[PDB]
């Protein structure tokens, strides 16, 4: 054993997925006013399987002739949650090397 795949766990992939998720939410907020755009959601378990997709969000309310299915209340909350979890993933993956370096150097 003793390999980076096992030392880092899955925290090496989660940081990437949280970046992709943040990009999609940023797209949804920007495309909220453009008619005909369908809100895109990212399935977390899919990138989990890709580590070891880009779906559509069904609206809770009807459109108003635009056909745009973006709820700005939902997007802000989902962007806040993703950003908080992204920082935790950096903390988890960052400490993997800090412990790894301390084991090797002994100091």
């Amino acid at each position: 054993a003793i390999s980076f795949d096992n030392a880092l766990g899955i925290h090496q992939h989660t940081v990437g997925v949280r970046e992709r998720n943040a990009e999609v939410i940023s797209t949804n907020i920007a495309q909220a006013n453009t008619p005909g755009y369908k809100a895109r959601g990212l399935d977390f378990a899919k990138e989990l399987q890709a580590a070891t997709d880009k779906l559509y969000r069904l609206p809770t309310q009807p459109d108003t002739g635009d056909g745009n299915t973006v709820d700005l209340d939902l997007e802000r909350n989902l962007f806040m949650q993703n950003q908080i979890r992204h920082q935790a993933s950096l903390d988890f993956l960052g400490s993997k090397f800090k412990n790894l370096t301390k084991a090797i150097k002994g100091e």
């Binding site: 006013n33 453009t34 008619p35 005909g36 108003t64 002739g65 635009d66 056909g67």
Partner: protein, 32 residues
């Protein structure tokens, strides 16, 4: 495909109110 249209007040209307030009409303489906 590319999807587009007029945003804001004009699009957030029932189709009976023909504020949106006819060809622009076509773009709101799909294009390539």
């Amino acid at each position: 495909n590319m999807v587009a249209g007029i945003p804001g007040a004009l699009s957030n209307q029932p189709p009976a109110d023909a504020s949106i030009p006819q060809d622009v409303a076509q773009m709101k489906d799909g294009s390539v």
